């Protein structure tokens, strides 16, 4: 419950006909992060050192 | 004067190769051209006789 994925853009795909390079370029971009509402919340484990 | 326009001579396309498929050279090289002009004008012949 402490973690939320702040969004802003979803995966969005855009095609640019590059033309010059004959290429067609597809760009998929998304803005998203993982943030914790509060600082505590996750404890991880580790193999020993 | 008369100044007709003369089309320029032909360019050549560039045969791009296989590496240059995604690069900006995949479109070859510019077939630049420029018209050239010819100028037509007349000089004069005259003569006279009196009787």
Curated annotation (Swiss-Prot), chain A:
It comes from the Viruses. It is found in: Virion. Major capsid protein that self-associates to form 120 hexamers and 11 pentamers, building the T=13 icosahedral capsid which about 860 Angstroms in diameter. Responsible for its self-assembly into a procapsid. The phage does not need to encode a separate scaffolfing protein because its capsid protein contains the delta domain that carries that function. The capsid gains its final stability through the reorganization of the subunits that takes place upon expansion. DNA encapsidation through the portal triggers capsid expansion and the binding of the decoration protein to the capsid exterior. Interacts with the decoration protein; each hexon binds a single copy of the decoration protein. Interacts with the portal protein. This is Major capsid protein. The gene is D20. The chain holds residues 409 to 457 of 458 of the full protein.
